[PDB]
């Protein structure tokens, strides 16, 4: 809402064309570049309308049920902590604004409560909805200790405030991760604030036993009827890393035996699929880090994994891609930007894919921060599992992983770690899937 | 310190023995019940000291490593949004206190900004400061002077208070550098008054919606299991499932040395390297599930008329639960739901924390007789596939594990247990290893079982 309020209706405003254009107007669409012969400094943008992957009758149904499932999702994600709260001006209430948190069914002293010399009597009310208040300061009368509503009354202002330094909140009902919006009040004044109720996060620390690559890194791949390429890969890896474990997910119809020291071969139902096999491979990794390589890759003296290890050891990144070099001699890092822009409510949003990166990774020449990369990368195993390779993407997929991970996964890309590359209804289905899964109406590729 | 500050040193205080005992004193330990013959109303508590799984050397080492990796983890988790901020009393500054959020490298109008100063003054001025973004004011209110549009520091100056406040209604924040999930603590200020507040900078969460296809069980549910050289039990299981659910997919992870053929309609059989193990096989099975929900069953189970999956589906369809366990009935006729409570208590800094396991539940699940909320359950359960994958079956747990899953999920996974959905049950160095693993993984020194 931009429209001027009554109180300020008279006050004149000239719109800043430039800045108002920065706001999300929930009206995005996806348009193709003008067609024909291209121009040198222009990139051709091409649009995909995912709504056209449905029968117009089915489209309505899909949009409805997608909206319904989304409303359900909201209700199980969102917290009173996410409410817009406005701090009142000119209140004598001093209260914690953020960063007050308790474990479920635990207790804490509440910081920073006070009432800001000598009056009649001073009284403050505390109200909670998922917990109970407790504290005795000489001179101060308490009403409601061990209840959701607590009154503190004291002729001593210093006293009242000293007792406030000793006010405790206790979570009274068990929930996993929520919050309780408390009310702190005095005569003619009201303040809302939120205590977060949650468990501390699982830190998932790795035992240890430069860098021990065998201890830190598992190599994961997926193959299908390409045993020649796969064996060349394993041979090449062994030329530089003799004891690193290689996990191989395999959905071949008549699987050959693959074995050797530190190789683990997993057989899947014939044509179970690509991402399913990737999900399989990662689920078997016990090391801090996993390296994804395609079955058609070859290690060279340029595949210096230590450098990728270094990056993840020394930076907050979760995933760091290398570069893949074609036999044509060109090496790509496939640095991609993925952003979702708000579209019409219930049509869905618009995905924008474009080549590029966000910024250089300070301290690490040749490395940048981006949204997606080529399928040669080292990553924290847990973060990869957290995002997952959606087993439904069975045939042709790549960026969809980075899209599933978008914002959750800290992505980087280093050009100096290099691996060599050895020389439909599915499309429609994926369009329907991505429409539903990610609430998209369309996408542009660039 | 409990100690009073100088300002308040003169004030007398009574220690509530009862209340002080509620606080975390970072000093837990784990002690066994007395030995000998038990008494009827008493439950035997048994302690495990995890630290005894290491030599004094290794203990020292591991504590160090663990503390270092923990500090690392903290630094990549924690945010300015976690800082304690205290709202000033008697300030003319009105500002958003929580719930203001922007996507990285995007922009928003900042809600609720205003200066509630008294009218009559010669000039009104407000300062805005950011650290990861820049201010702009969209439409310009006539009478207001702006300094710093498109910079991290912005000044609004106006003779008219009305004008200033109208201008504040139009202030925008833009994120200027890309990060995935962080926050920026802004400063809003006027003469002799200061207000801090935090804008969260993050992407909206992946909603991961499932097409729906009362309830189509084949669409909503995949059944997952893991077997090892027990094809008799497994075939009985599949036969029993098919007696009630002809087209539900059964995913079977298998680490047998010489695997038999399992196949039949809607069966997916996955072969693992010999003896890769228990949780690894569970992790494998779940990684292959495409449905909104997964049902875990052991290879030694049997479906009966009592295995009415629809009821478990109903629970997850109608409640915020992520996982809902059933009951497993022994051939002795007793059915267990194995409702467990798991809690960690803060221990001495760098010895680690104490895990308390005890039989029990938190409360009844309102609206669903026979169902409770708890921390862990027996290995018969329906769950949201994504949440199960989010927690994972640690592939390191190769032999003997159960509650370890619920512990890995503790806090993250919303657990329920219904007594009325029932399945039948057909008639060391590794211990030390697991103890060392649990020590690091969960920063624990000891545990008690009850
Ligand atoms: C590295 O890990 C391997 C295999 O996991 C182990 O056998 C070896 O002792 C480790 N090496 C070092 C230098 O710690
Ligand atoms: C349930 O879903 C399955 C799996 O795709 C489908 O083949 C079957 O037709 C569905 N049953 C009904 C009646 O919805
Ligand atoms: Mn290829
Ligand atoms: Mn058994």
Is residue A271 helix, strand or coil? Answer: coil
Chain A residues 187-246 with a CB less than 8 Å from chain B: 191-194, 198-208
Q: What Rg do the C-alpha atoms of chain A give, in angstroms?
A: 29
Q: Are residues B372 and B223 in the same domain?
A: yes
Cα B138-B140-B143 angle, rounded to 5 deg: 155
Contacts of B288 in chain A (CB under 8 A): 268, 272, 276, 279-280, 391
Cα-Cα end-to-end distance for chain B: 34
Q: How far is CA B419 from the centre of its chain?
A: 25
Q: What is the rounded distance in angstroms from the CA atom of residue B271 to the CA atom of residue B215?
A: 32
Q: Are residues B256 and B308 in the same domain?
A: yes
Q: Are residues A231 and A188 in the same domain?
A: no
Method of determination used here: X-ray
Q: Inter-chain contact A176–B288, Cβ cutoff 8 Å?
A: no
The answer to whether A325 touches A421, Cβ cutoff 8 Å, is yes
In the Cβ-directed half-sphere of B326, how many Cα atoms lie within 13 Å? Answer: 29
Is residue B61 helix, strand or coil? Answer: helix
Neighbours of B352 (CB within 10 A): 26
The answer to whether B387 touches B286, Cβ cutoff 8 Å, is no
Which residue do the tokens 């899947």 mark?
Answer: A268
Instruction: Spell out which residues line ligand 1, taking CB within 6 angstroms.
Output: A 209, 212, 214-215, 243
Q: Are residues A300 and A363 in the same domain?
A: yes
Phi/psi region, residue B112 (left: phi>0; alpha: psi -120 to 50; beta: rest), is: left
Q: What is the rounded distance in angstroms from the CA atom of residue B433 to the CA atom of residue B439?
A: 10
Q: Are residues B317 and B423 in the same domain?
A: yes
Please say which residue of B202, B225, B259 terminates a domain. Answer: B202
Q: What is the rounded distance in angstroms from the CA atom of residue A404 to the CA atom of residue A390?
A: 8
The answer to whether A147 touches A131, Cβ cutoff 8 Å, is no
Would residue B333 count as lying in a domain?
yes
Cβ partners under 8 Å of residue A62, min gap 6: A54, A432, A435, A436, B211
Q: Are strands B301-302 and A336-341 parallel, antiparallel or unpaired?
A: unpaired
Contacts of B286 in chain A (CB under 8 A): 283
> Which of A162, A209, A387 to substitute to test the interface with B, most B CBs within 10 Å?
A162
Q: Inter-chain contact B139–A85, Cβ cutoff 8 Å?
A: no
Q: Are residues A398 and A427 in the same domain?
A: yes
Q: How far is CA B163 from the centre of its chain?
A: 47
CATH number at residue A163: 2.60.40
Q: CB of A282 within 8 Å of any CB in chain B?
A: yes
Cα A271-A273-A278 angle, rounded to 5 deg: 140
Is residue A384 helix, strand or coil? Answer: helix
Q: At what angle do helices B56-77 and B429-442 cross, to 10 degrees?
A: 40
**Residue B299 CA, ligand 4 centroid: distance in Å:** 8
Would residue A79 count as lying in a domain?
no
Looking at chain A, which residue has its C-alpha nearest residue B318? A72
CATH number at residue B238: 3.90.550.10
Q: Which residue numbers in chain B precede an interruption (C–N > 2.5 Å)? A: 213, 427
The answer to whether B397 touches B12, Cβ cutoff 8 Å, is no
Least Cα distance to A177 among A244, A122, A130 occurs for A130
Residue B292 exposed, middle or buried by CB count within 10 Å (0-12, 13-18, 19+)? buried
Would residue B161 count as lying in a domain?
yes
> What resolution in Å is listed for this PDB structure?
3.0
Say what the alpha-carbon torsion angle B284, B289, B295, B300 is, to the nearest 10 degrees.
-40
The answer to whether B365 touches B372, Cβ cutoff 8 Å, is yes
Contacts of A280 in chain B (CB under 8 A): 270, 284, 287-288
Would residue B52 count as lying in a domain?
no
Least Cα distance to B97 among A98, A93, A185 occurs for A98
Chain B residues 307-366 with a CB less than 8 Å from chain A: 320, 362-363
**Residue A229 CA, ligand 3 centroid: distance in Å:** 10
Q: Provide the shortest C-alpha distance from residue A425 to chain B (in Å).
A: 17
Give CA separation, A150 vs A111, A133, B87, in Å: 16, 6, 21
Q: Provide the shortest C-alpha distance from residue A105 to chain B (in Å).
A: 10
Cα B384-A351-B171 angle, rounded to 5 deg: 100
Q: How far is CA B174 from the centre of its chain?
A: 31
Would residue B207 count as lying in a domain?
no
Q: Evaluate the CA torsion angle B281, B282, B287, B288 in order and state its sign.
A: positive
Please say which residue of B170, B202, B234 terminates a domain. Answer: B202
Phi/psi region, residue B382 (left: phi>0; alpha: psi -120 to 50; beta: rest), is: beta
Would residue B183 count as lying in a domain?
yes
Residue of minimum CA distance from atom 14 in ligand 1? A212
Please say which residue of B202, B227, B247 terminates a domain. Answer: B202
Q: What domain range includes position A130?
A: 93-198
Q: Are residues B223 and B197 in the same domain?
A: no
Q: Inter-chain contact A20–B139, Cβ cutoff 8 Å?
A: yes
Q: Are residues B294 and B415 in the same domain?
A: yes
SS (H, E, C) B262-316: CCCCCEEEEECCCCCCHHHHHHHHHHCCCCCEEEECCCCEECCCCCCHHHHHHHH
Residue B38 exposed, middle or buried by CB count within 10 Å (0-12, 13-18, 19+)? exposed
**Structure token pair of residue A413:** 């890309």
Would residue B160 count as lying in a domain?
yes
**Structure token pair of residue B213:** 């296809």
Q: Are residues B131 and B234 in the same domain?
A: no
Q: How many domains does chain A have?
A: 2
Say what the alpha-carbon torsion angle A31, A36, A41, A46 is, to the nearest 10 degrees.
30
Q: Inter-chain contact B276–A283, Cβ cutoff 8 Å?
A: no
Q: Are residues A308 and A440 in the same domain?
A: yes
User: Could you write out the DSSP letters of every residue in A14-60?
Assistant: E--HHHHTTS--S-B---PPP-SS--TT----EEEEGGGGS-HHHHH
Contacts within 8 Å (CB) and 24+ apart, B264-271: B264/B238, B266/B218, B267/B238, B268/A268, B268/A269, B268/A272, B269/A269, B270/A266, B270/A267, B270/A268, B270/A269, B270/A280, B271/A266, B271/A267
Q: Are residues A268 and A156 in the same domain?
A: no
Looking at chain A, which residue has its C-alpha nearest residue B212? A65
The phi and psi torsions of A428 (rounded to 5 degrees) equal -60, -45
Would residue A23 count as lying in a domain?
no
Q: Are residues B309 and B265 in the same domain?
A: yes
User: Could you write out the DSSP letters of every residue in A212-261?
Assistant: -HHHHEEEEEEESS-HHHHHHHHHHHHTT-SS--EEEEE--SSPPP--ST
Q: Evaluate the CA torsion angle A344, A349, A350, A354 in order and state its sign.
A: positive
Least Cα distance to A208 among B280, B348, B72 occurs for B72
Is residue B107 helix, strand or coil? Answer: strand
Least Cα distance to A139 among A120, A159, A161 occurs for A159
């Amino acid at each position: 809402d931009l429209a001027p309020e009554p109180r300020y209706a008279h006050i004149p405003v000239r719109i800043k064309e430039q800045v108002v254009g920065l706001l999300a107007w929930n009206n995005c669409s996806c348009e193709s570049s003008g067609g024909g012969l291209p121009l040198p400094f222009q990139k051709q943008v091409r649009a995909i309308d995912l709504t056209k992957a449905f029968d117009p009758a089915e489209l309505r149904a899909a949009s409805a049920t997608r909206e319904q499932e989304f409303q359900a999702f909201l209700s199980r994600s969102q917290s009173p902590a996410d409410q817009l709260l406005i701090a009142p001006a000119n209140s004598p209430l001093q209260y914690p604004l953020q960063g007050v948190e308790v474990q479920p069914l635990r207790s804490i002293l509440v910081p920073g409560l006070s009432l800001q010399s000598g009056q009649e009597v001073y009284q403050v009310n505390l109200t909670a909805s998922l917990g109970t208040w407790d504290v005795e300061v000489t001179g101060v009368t308490l009403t409601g200790e061990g209840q959701a509503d607590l009154t503190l009354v004291s002729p001593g202002l210093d006293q009242l405030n000293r007792q406030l330094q000793l006010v405790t909140y206790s979570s009274r009902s068990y929930q996993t991760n929520t919050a309780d919006t408390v009310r702190f009040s005095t005569e003619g004044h009201e303040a809302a604030f939120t205590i977060r109720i949650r468990h501390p996060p699982n830190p998932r620390l790795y035992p240890p036993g430069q860098y021990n690559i065998s201890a830190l890194v598992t190599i994961a791949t997926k193959t299908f009827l390409r045993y020649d390429r796969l064996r060349a890969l394993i041979t090449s890896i062994r030329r530089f890393y003799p004891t690193v474990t290689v996990v191989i997910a395999d959905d071949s119809d008549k699987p050959e035996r693959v074995s050797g020291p530190y190789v683990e071969h997993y057989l899947m139902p014939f044509g179970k699929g690509w991402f399913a096999g990737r999900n399989l491979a990662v689920s078997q990794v016990t090391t801090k880090y996993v390296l994804w390589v395609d079955d058609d890759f070859v290690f060279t003296a340029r595949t210096r994994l230590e450098r990728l290890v270094d990056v993840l050891e020394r930076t907050p990144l979760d995933l760091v891609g290398g570069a893949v070099r074609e036999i044509s001699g060109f090496a790509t890092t496939y640095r991609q930007l993925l952003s979702v822009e708000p579209g019409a409510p219930g049509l869905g949003n618009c995905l924008r894919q474009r080549r590029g990166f966000h910024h250089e990774l300070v301290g690490f020449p040749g490395c940048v921060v981006t949204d997606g990369v080529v399928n040669f990368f080292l990553a924290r195993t847990d973060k990869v599992r957290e995002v997952g390779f959606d087993p439904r993407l069975s045939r042709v997929a790549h960026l969809e992983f980075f899209l599933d991970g978008l914002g959750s996964l800290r992505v980087g890309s280093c050009s100096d770690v290099v691996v060599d590359h050895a020389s439909d209804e599915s499309q429609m289905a994926k369009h329907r899937l991505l429409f539903f899964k990610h609430r998209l109406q369309c996408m542009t590729s660039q």
